[PDB]
Design a protein around this nucleic acid. Structure first.
Lengths: 65, 67
DNA sequence: TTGTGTTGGCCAATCA
DNA sequence: ATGATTGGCCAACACA
């Protein structure tokens, strides 16, 4: 029964659980969107590093010439 | 007038828009999870490449030094 | 003003 | 029994 006290504490506690469950999921989804930003920046950095190292190797190999 | 006819049809339209909006959001999330796996594979490829070149450079520098 | 898209809350069923 | 999930729906508000 809606007027039942047990019912009331039930709804009160579930409303807290539901909000909590959904706030957690919103968090996880934002984290994933975040990882995409980090991985993208990091791959960009590493790619530039691949290019820097390649230049250093070419500069060294010119000494042979 | 939460008993009206205009009301019930307004509710129907919103409930449809809500399901559509939620499907779109969940799809977007699915795509993002995919983008992460993709970026992760690329990141590991780049890591190996940088390590490989660093060792190559190190070996080569050691050679010149040994002159 | 109106209509759709978003966001977040509630109820209830179901899982753990 | 209790907290976590999930899906249907309401309503305010953002966006056009």
């Amino acid at each position: 029964d809606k007027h039942s006290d047990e019912y009331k504490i039930r709804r009160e506690r579930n409303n807290i659980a539901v909000r909590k469950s959904r706030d957690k999921a919103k968090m996880r989804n934002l984290e994933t969107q975040h990882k995409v930003l980090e991985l993208t920046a990091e791959n960009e950095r590493l790619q530039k590093k691949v290019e820097q190292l390649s230049r250093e190797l070419s500069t060294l190999r010119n000494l042979f010439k």
